Design an enzyme around this catalytic site. Structure first.
Site, short mmCIF file in Angstrom:
data_model
loop_
_atom_site.label_atom_id
_atom_site.label_comp_id
_atom_site.label_asym_id
_atom_site.label_seq_id
_atom_site.Cartn_x
_atom_site.Cartn_y
_atom_site.Cartn_z
N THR A 159 0.79 -1.23 0.00
CA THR A 159 0.00 0.00 0.00
C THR A 159 0.82 1.28 0.00
O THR A 159 0.69 2.10 -0.91
CB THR A 159 -0.98 0.03 1.18
N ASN A 180 5.64 -1.98 3.81
CA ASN A 180 4.64 -1.54 4.77
C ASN A 180 5.25 -1.57 6.16
O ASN A 180 4.70 -0.98 7.09
CB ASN A 180 3.36 -2.38 4.69
N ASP A 691 27.96 1.88 -14.40
CA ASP A 691 29.19 2.12 -13.63
C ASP A 691 30.26 2.84 -14.44
O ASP A 691 30.48 2.52 -15.61
CB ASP A 691 29.81 0.81 -13.13
O1 LIG Z 1 -5.63 8.71 3.37
C1 LIG Z 1 -4.73 7.95 2.93
O2 LIG Z 1 -4.14 8.14 1.64
C2 LIG Z 1 -4.50 9.31 0.85
C3 LIG Z 1 -3.71 9.30 -0.47
C4 LIG Z 1 -4.41 9.19 -1.71
C5 LIG Z 1 -3.71 9.19 -2.93
C6 LIG Z 1 -2.30 9.31 -2.90
O3 LIG Z 1 -1.62 9.23 -4.13
C7 LIG Z 1 -1.97 9.97 -5.29
F1 LIG Z 1 -3.00 10.77 -5.03
F2 LIG Z 1 -0.98 10.73 -5.80
F3 LIG Z 1 -2.39 9.13 -6.25
C8 LIG Z 1 -1.58 9.43 -1.69
C9 LIG Z 1 -2.30 9.42 -0.47
N1 LIG Z 1 -4.20 6.83 3.62
C10 LIG Z 1 -4.70 6.45 4.99
C11 LIG Z 1 -4.51 4.93 5.04
C12 LIG Z 1 -3.93 4.08 6.19
N2 LIG Z 1 -3.64 2.81 5.42
C13 LIG Z 1 -3.61 1.49 5.90
O4 LIG Z 1 -3.58 1.31 7.13
C14 LIG Z 1 -3.56 0.25 5.04
C15 LIG Z 1 -4.55 0.11 4.04
C16 LIG Z 1 -4.64 -1.06 3.26
C17 LIG Z 1 -3.74 -2.05 3.53
N3 LIG Z 1 -3.53 -3.34 3.04
C18 LIG Z 1 -2.47 -3.89 3.80
O5 LIG Z 1 -1.99 -4.98 3.75
O6 LIG Z 1 -1.98 -2.97 4.73
C19 LIG Z 1 -2.76 -1.84 4.57
N4 LIG Z 1 -2.62 -0.72 5.32
C20 LIG Z 1 -3.48 3.13 3.96
C21 LIG Z 1 -3.38 4.66 4.02
C22 LIG Z 1 -3.72 5.62 2.89
CA LIG Z 2 -3.33 -1.65 -0.21
CA LIG Z 3 25.92 1.47 -11.03
CL LIG Z 4 6.34 -5.02 3.89
ZN LIG Z 5 -4.14 -4.58 1.86
#
Ligand SMILES: O=C(OCc1ccc(OC(F)(F)F)cc1)N1C[C@@H]2CN(C(=O)c3ccc4[nH]c(=O)oc4n3)C[C@H]2C1
Ligand SMILES: [Ca+2]
Ligand SMILES: [Ca+2]
Ligand SMILES: [Cl-]
Ligand SMILES: [Zn+2]
Ligand SMILES: *[C@@H]1O[C@H](CO)[C@@H](O[C@@H]2O[C@H](CO)[C@@H](O[C@@H]3O[C@H](CO[C@H]4O[C@H](CO)[C@@H](O)[C@H](O[C@H]5O[C@H](CO)[C@@H](O)[C@H](O)[C@@H]5O[C@H]5O[C@H](CO)[C@@H](O)[C@H](O)[C@@H]5O)[C@@H]4O)[C@@H](O)[C@H](O[C@H]4O[C@H](CO)[C@@H](O)[C@H](O)[C@@H]4O[C@H]4O[C@H](CO)[C@@H](O)[C@H](O)[C@@H]4O)[C@@H]3O)[C@H](O)[C@H]2NC(C)=O)[C@H](O)[C@H]1NC(C)=O
Ligand code: NA
Ligand code: NA
Length: 805
Positions: A159, A180, A691
């Protein structure tokens, strides 16, 4: 400390963040526990829900409601998204026929079309077809706008690495978010999904789109949303921001959805429980589009619908345990799951040895579901090595599987049916792209592309100059109606020499022998013309590659091939040849098995020598143009020139010889002729860049002949395979590889079998883009074609993945 005793009155979802210990009212305050006392009350209103109903129409403004159906709401910019549909007889956006948006139709005061990025976590590419019945809003976007059948994430397909790649155009190895979960040895710190450490700026390198925008005077909405702010409120906030006065209004916005990823972890990618999450995502899109239409912004705004990665079927009973392989499993730390990263538990332990750990994990069980690598040996296409946060030892895990340290770690941590993070070529990891708006094309399908490319296009969509990044600017020009960026070809830095016959045989003391002392006025004018470049139009189909650094090199012509020979590295940088469909494979005659001939155009002092190879018990040698594919017995002698020779481990020669003897001819048959460009690669510091001379860690024993870390080939033909490669009138077709030059074939578990059972599989694993090869060699290919530069850029970014449909 936060003095949380101020107010959010008139400050709900403020754009500029205030300094502690003052209390905050921004869309991230919750995640810091720093919102003012009244935030929930004033900023997160929920009374009466999210929709207008027939009897709310023209009501008296009650400030307690979540949204408004009163008469003044359009001016205040805070109606429920369906207000016009319910109270003014209007139609939903999705129920309207789509009409081409030839120009931006914006309200007065808008200096540019705004950009809305709608990002969806875990939205697998195949959901577009498979969930099409329950996603009408998303399906209208797809078919009226521009779309790809899928978009390729970066490795690891997690993510944070993928969201921050979207935002920066950088490989995770360069932006710093390499997983992550992370440990940084220089910081002595860890990065987790839970906790406060992830909020420190020091993890996050590069320059994200919102900062690029701010620095150049374009205003940005805040990209990140706290998890407890419901979807409906995020949409209304974006819409409110769009109602602000010209001087206050952002030009770029972001929406994030935790679905379908959240459910897909529980129920798997196609679990029956997955239909509902897709319905709700589509409802949220409908709301945004209905909102835009109310404010007359639906033919003004560019909307990007984009995913971070897909989702695969994964269960607990598909777990491999390191404890079934290792004895010393307590002296190691593993980062577990869909990828493996191993380091020492304690650096005060001098008995820890990575070499023996790898050996204990290599081809140990016949069905083994992961493969260990030193990071520098990972396929170059993953670009996953050049960061202190990436452990020396890496496990590439098979799709559908997990890796854990001990069984205790899995049951004292089945909870899950889905996961992601595998190799970025895996079908189930592919995600989506749709662009819709005045700057995107109308009803257009584009080929699959990588997510590293989007940062450039978003900068284009906003009139910004992109920070230095890994995209290839101009390679996605075919997505856009206008706003295009017009790239130029890099200027050649070094021009070549064209040496003639300048040296006599006896000046050479290279310790090389050849059985070639045999003997015509017709056939001797002929051989001269070949060495002057008569057949060059045959073997150099797209111009010679440009050298983009300062060096000293010669162009050498031959009947069957052409090369640019480097006087610094004592070998060619590149060798170019064409193999037509009708061409024949011969063998190397018995008297010519160990033949190496001095090249009378190149001084002894800039040549390799045969003695070094004899003395070097580990190192042997091979040829770039294969003797097997010589066009005549007489032309074959050209292939044995000391200037066609390159250093090769005996173990690697097995791979090389099969490719040259069997596969090239096979590709010529299947593709109606192929053009081949092969060469050495030197990347001892594994940064993915060429290199310099002073960076080589290994030479052929007792000489200045440097040892390549990799060997590449670029195989080109006509996209219309009814035309032979050497007479192609239209678009080209390419596939390439970068094979690691290794002294053993430990990577392939079946290597004691015949080359025909394992070689091609290995090549497939190390498939590459021409662009990857350009970084690694400092060359620039396809300089003379009849195609547009934009089209050639697309070609250079292409990756042949070998996945099924
Ligand atoms: O608001 C958020 O992101 C806005 C955002 C939108 C577009 C962006 O890029 C672009 F716009 F340029 F395109 C950049 C940022 N966040 C809050 C969330 C907490 N998360 C998890 O905790 C998680 C979520 C899913 C998961 N799956 C997993 O295995 O672990 C995970 N962790 C995922 C985080 C993303
Ligand atoms: Ca994800
Ligand atoms: Ca190199
Ligand atoms: Cl990881
Ligand atoms: Zn996920
Ligand atoms: C993908 O695209 C990216 C971006 O375009 C490419 O990466 C660039 O490659 C350049 C060449 O390697 C590199 O240029 C160097 O910059 C050094 C200063 O860099 C700082 O400033 C930039 C710009 O604001 C900033 O982005 C950097 O941030 C890095 O570092 C911080 C922490 O340290 C991280 O938070 C951040 O994530 C990022 O880390 C990443 O990059 C570094 C390398 O810079 C890696 O080590 C990390 O693993 C990670 O990937 C920096 O804050 C500058 O010092 C260099 O100059 C040296 O070399 C030149 C050669 O011309 C020489 O002339 C100079 O004298 C100098 O040498 C001196 O220092 C040497 C080492 O100490 C020493 O040996 C000598 O004796 C000398 O004293 C160099 O110019 C650029 O920084 C990155 N940019 C980014 C964003 O990563 C990448 O190549 C692309 N990938 C592919 C495959 O194409
Ligand atoms: Na040898
Ligand atoms: Na093997």
């Amino acid at each position: 400390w936060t003095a949380t005793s101020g107010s959010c009155k008139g400050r709900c979802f403020e754009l500029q963040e205030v300094g502690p210990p003052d209390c905050r009212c921004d869309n991230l305050c919750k995640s810091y526990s720093s919102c003012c006392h009244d935030f929930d009350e004033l900023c997160l209103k929920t009374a009466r829900g999210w929709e207008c109903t027939k009897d709310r129409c023209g009501e008296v403004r009650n400030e307690e409601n979540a949204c408004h159906c009163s008469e003044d709401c359009l001016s205040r910019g805070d109606c429920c998204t369906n207000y016009q549909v319910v109270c003014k007889g209007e139609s939903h956006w999705v129920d309207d026929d789509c009409e081409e948006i030839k120009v931006p139709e914006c309200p007065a005061g808008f200096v540019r079309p705004p950009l809305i990025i709608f990002s969806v976590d875990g939205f697998r590419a195949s959901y577009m077809k498979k969930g099409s019945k329950v996603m009408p809003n998303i399906e209208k976007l797809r078919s009226c706008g521009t779309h790809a059948p899928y978009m390729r994430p970066v490795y690891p397909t997690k993510t944070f690495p993928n969201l921050y790649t979207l935002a920066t155009g950088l490989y995770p190895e360069s932006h710093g978010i390499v997983g992550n979960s992370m440990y940084d040895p220089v910081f002595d710190a860890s990065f987790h999904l839970r906790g406060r450490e992830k909020f420190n700026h020091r993890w996050w390198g590069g320059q994200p789109l919102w900062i690029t925008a701010t620095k150049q005077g374009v205003r940005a909405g805040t990209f990140f949303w706290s998890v407890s702010i419901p979807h409906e409120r995020r949409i209304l906030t974006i819409l409110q921001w769009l109602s602000l006065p010209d001087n206050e209004r952002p030009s770029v916005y972001a929406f994030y959805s935790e679905q379908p990823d959240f459910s897909g972890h529980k129920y798997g990618p196609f679990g029956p429980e997955m239909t509902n999450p897709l319905r709700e995502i589509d409802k949220t899109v409908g709301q945004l589009m209905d909102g835009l239409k109310q404010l007359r912004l639906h033919r003004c705004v560019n909307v990007i619908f984009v995913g971070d990665h897909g989702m695969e079927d994964v269960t607990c009973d598909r777990t491999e345990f390191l404890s079934n392989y290792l004895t010393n499993v307590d002296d190691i730390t593993l980062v577990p799951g869909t990828l493996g990263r191993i380091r020492a538990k304690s650096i005060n332990n001098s008995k820890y040895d990575p070499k023996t750990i790898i050996a204990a994990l290599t081809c140990k069980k016949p069905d083994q579901h992961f493969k260990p690598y030193m990071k520098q040996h990972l396929p170059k296409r993953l670009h996953y090595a050049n960061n202190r946060r990436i452990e020396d030892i890496h496990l590439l895990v098979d799709r559908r599987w997990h890796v854990a340290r001990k069984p205790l770690d899995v049951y004292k941590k089945c909870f899950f049916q889905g996961d992601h993070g595998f190799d970025n070529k895996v079908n189930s990891m592919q995600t989506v792209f749709v662009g819709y708006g005045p700057t995107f094309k109308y009803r257009t399908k584009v080929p699959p592309f990588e997510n590293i490319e989007l940062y450039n296009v978003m900068c284009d969509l906003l009139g910004l100059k992109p920070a230095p990044n890994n995209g290839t600017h101009g390679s996605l020009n075919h997505l856009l109606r206008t706003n295009t960026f017009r790239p130029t070809m890099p200027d050649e830095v070094s021009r070549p020499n064209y040496p003639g016959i300048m040296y006599l045989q006896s000046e050479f003391d290279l310790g090389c022998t050849c059985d070639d002392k045999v003997e015509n006025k017709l056939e001797e004018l002929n051989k001269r013309l070949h060495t002057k470049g008569s057949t060059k139009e045959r073997h150099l189909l797209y111009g010679r590659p440009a050298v983009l650094y300062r060096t000293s090199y010669d162009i050498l012509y031959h009947t069957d091939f052409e090369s640019g020979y480097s006087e610094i590295f004592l070998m060619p940088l590149w060798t170019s040849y064409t193999i037509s469909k009708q061409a024949e494979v011969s063998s190397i005659p018995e008297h010519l098995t160990n033949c190496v001939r001095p090249d009378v155009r190149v001084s002894p002092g800039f040549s390799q020598n045969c003695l070094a190879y004899k003395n070097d018990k580990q190192m042997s040698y091979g040829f770039l143009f294969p003797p097997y594919l010589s066009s005549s017995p007489e032309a074959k002698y050209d292939a044995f020139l000391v200037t066609n020779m390159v250093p090769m481990y005996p173990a690697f020669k097995r791979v090389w010889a099969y490719f040259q003897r069997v596969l090239v001819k096979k590709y010529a048959s299947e593709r109606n002729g192929v053009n081949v460009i092969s060469g050495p690669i030197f990347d001892y510091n594994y940064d993915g860049l060429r290199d310099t001379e002073d960076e080589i860690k290994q030479y052929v024993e007792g000489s200045s002949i440097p040892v390549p870390t990799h060997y590449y080939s670029i195989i080109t033909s006509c996209l219309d395979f009814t035309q032979p490669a050497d007479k192609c009138d239209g678009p080209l077709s390419v596939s390439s590889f970068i094979l690691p030059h290794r002294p053993d074939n430990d990577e392939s578990c079946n290597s004691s079998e015949d080359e025909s059972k394992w070689v091609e599989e290995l090549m497939k694993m190390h498939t590459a883009r021409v662009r990857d090869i350009e970084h690694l060699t400092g060359l620039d290919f396809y300089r003379k074609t009849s195609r547009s530069y934009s089209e050639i850029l697309t070609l250079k970014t292409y990756l042949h993945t070998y996945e099924s449909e």
